[PDB]
Ligand binder design. Sequence first.
Ligand code: NA
Lengths: 209, 103
Amino acid sequence: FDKKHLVSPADALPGRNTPMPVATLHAVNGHSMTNVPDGMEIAIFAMGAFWGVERLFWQLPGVYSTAAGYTGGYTPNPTYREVASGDTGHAEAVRIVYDPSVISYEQLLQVFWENHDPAQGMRQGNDHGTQYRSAIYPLTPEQDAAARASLERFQAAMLAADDDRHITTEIANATPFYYAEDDHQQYLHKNPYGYAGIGGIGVCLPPEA
Amino acid sequence: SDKIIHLTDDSFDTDVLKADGAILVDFWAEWCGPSKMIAPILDEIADEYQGKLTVAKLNIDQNPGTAPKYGIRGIPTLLLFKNGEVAATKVGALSKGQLKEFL
Ligand code: NA
């Protein structure tokens, strides 16, 4: 929401300059953990503890790849410990490579608003901390417009569902996206019986408004 | 439940507005989880409240016209009509019991 409720830039952890080792293939679909096939695009979201979120997205037809990571903070190339301390300023986020010809940014936004609670401030579900905050990180002006309008509409939907809470979602231009450790990539596919947050307040974002 | 009406846009004015008795209109979509969630509850209500009330679904993908005419702002929305005008509204998913709409 406002950068003041994070760690201050002067207090953020210094991090390192060498990037996290990333596996070559996605653990579920065998696609490239990094490449973006011609005509495809990236979306970046934060919806809370990021295991369940990554699974939520790689199951959508049209998503080429997903990846768990850390973004929106100050610390370069953080570790899970560091992010969990709160002293990185990052949010646990997920990086999505999708084909606009099969799934559109508007639909990804619908998924976003439906599968977490965007009005919980510095927590999501039972997980407390700024690393669990709600955020949308546009990479293009078209996404910036689409995401901000969707925030408008979904706040209205919340009011219609007789919910007086105000959306705490951050929307900022995307900064470097740091991949999480290899253990977290496709975590719930490697560990089927692990933790996936309950999501959503029970309302969906109707189309085109 | 073979007691629920599936609507279309032009089908709306005839089937719910100029219709006698109480009609409950489900504004649903296949891609909205809470829609899928409350649908079986609507089946059981179509059974248990027959003769007091008719429920009727409306796919907002297959019928994008009539949902805007009533200013729905979230999905799902339940709209209870009594004689052409809208009596009650309820937005969002809700439980078995929470369907204690007025009468
Ligand atoms: Na976690």
